[PDB]
Amino acid sequence: QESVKEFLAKAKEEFLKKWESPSQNTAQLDHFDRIKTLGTGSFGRVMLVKHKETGNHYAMKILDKQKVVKLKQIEHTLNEKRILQAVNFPFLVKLEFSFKDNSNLYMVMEYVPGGEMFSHLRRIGRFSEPHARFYAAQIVLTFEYLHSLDLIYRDLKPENLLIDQQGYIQVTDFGFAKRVKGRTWTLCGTPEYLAPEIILSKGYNKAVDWWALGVLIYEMAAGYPPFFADQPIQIYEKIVSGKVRFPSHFSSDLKDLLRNLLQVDLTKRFGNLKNGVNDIKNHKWFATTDWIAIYQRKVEAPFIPKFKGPGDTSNFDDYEEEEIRVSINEKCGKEFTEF
Numbered sequence: 208q209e210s211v212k213e214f215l216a217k218a219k220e221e222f223l224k225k226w227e228s229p230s231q232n233t234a235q236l237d238h239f240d241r242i243k244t245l246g247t248g249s250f251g252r253v254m255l256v257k258h259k260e261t262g263n264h265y266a267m268k269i270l271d272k273q274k275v276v277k278l279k280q281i282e283h284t285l286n287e288k289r290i291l292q293a294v295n296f297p298f299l300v301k302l303e304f305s306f307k308d309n310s311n312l313y314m315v316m317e318y319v320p321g322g323e324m325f326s327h328l329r330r331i332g333r334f335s336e337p338h339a340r341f342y343a344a345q346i347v348l349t350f351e352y353l354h355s356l357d358l359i360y361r362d363l364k365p366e367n368l369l370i371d372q373q374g375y376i377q378v379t380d381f382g383f384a385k386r387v388k389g390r391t392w393t394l395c396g397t398p399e400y401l402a403p404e405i406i407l408s409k410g411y412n413k414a415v416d417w418w419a420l421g422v423l424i425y426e427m428a429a430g431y432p433p434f435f436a437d438q439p440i441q442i443y444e445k446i447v448s449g450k451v452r453f454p455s456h457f458s459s460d461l462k463d464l465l466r467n468l469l470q471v472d473l474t475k476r477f478g479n480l481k482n483g484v485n486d487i488k489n490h491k492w493f494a495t496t497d498w499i500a501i502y503q504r505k506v507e508a509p510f511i512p513k514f515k516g517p518g519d520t521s522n523f524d525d526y527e528e529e530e531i532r533v534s535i536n537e538k539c540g541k542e543f544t545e546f
């Protein structure tokens with residue numbers, strides 16, 4: 208374990224140096240060609256772009272400053288960029304450039320052509336336990352890394368897990384990630400993945416990520432999430448009850464792990480006990496996992512996504528292609544000074 212302690216100490220040193228002195232303004236919009244819209248939201252979109260001089264493809268997240276302000280996401284968007292420019296881990300999508308202009312904020316990330324885990328999960332129905340375990344191990348290591356930096360991720364769900372050319376996970380969307388020593392209070396995340404303490408408006412901590420991992424593993428192995436209902440209010444009632452029904456095809460080890468991750472009492476939840484992540488890593492469901500081999504990407508993946516090359520968009524969906532305009536006048540300059 209000294210090797211792991213020293214790895215995490217170095218990881219924190221390197222994070223803190225970038226955290227304290229964030230990079231800014233490392234590209235500009237007219238250095239890229241727009242290719243395709245890969246995703247949208249209420250205040251931003253993600254575009255496939257190509258750098259005009261190098262030919263490299265990237266996933267460019269574009270946030271409209273005026274909408275970020277209106278939807279009360281200022282602090283969250285500053286968190287997202289400051290954290291992304293400071294982290295470095297094999298299963299996190301890398302931020303290559305960031306910049307802003309009169310209208311928008313831009314985060315230029317590596318493009319992962321294999322698509323969201325969500326698509327592959329829905330296509331296949333459910334993943335076998337070995338397949339879910341391969342992905343789950345990556346998330347465990349990623350959360351060990353993030354939590355050691357005092358970061359809470361807060362948006363684990365299949366849509367945010369991209370599958371790369373080797374079949375490994377790259378986590379995207381740090382819009383809810385936050386550096387938290389102690390507790391935090393914001394209501395955020397997708398309903399099916401919210402821990403009870405979020406729904407109950409409590410001060411919560413990194414244990415919410417371990418709850419979300421329980422939801423993710425259940426959904427991967429069953430094909431649907433454990434607290435499924437038609438409307439958020441009904442989902443929330445199921446979550447706080449914590450009553451779960453496991454499919455009979457689940458192994459006993461999987462059920463036991465999930466009862467401990469989907470523990471309503473955060474003080475009893477795996478990942479949040481005295482032994483921290485080691486209660487998860489040492490659980491019988493992970494007995495076949497070589498944690499070092501996973502980290503080193505030496506395990507052959509269950510599944511390699513089909514795609515033709517680094518510019519292929521076939522694993523992503525089709526969206527209306529809308530203008531990306533830049534106002535002649537600066538909007539919300541003060542709010543985004545640090546970006």
Ligand SMILES: Cc1ccc(S(=O)(=O)N[C@@H]2CO[C@H](CO)[C@H]2O)cc1
Pocket residue numbers: 334335336337456457458
């Ligand atoms: C003998 C045995 C080997 C592997 C597993 S396993 O738990 O790794 N996989 C299970 C078998 O097929 C289902 C879907 O994966 C699971 O219940 C269980 C039992």
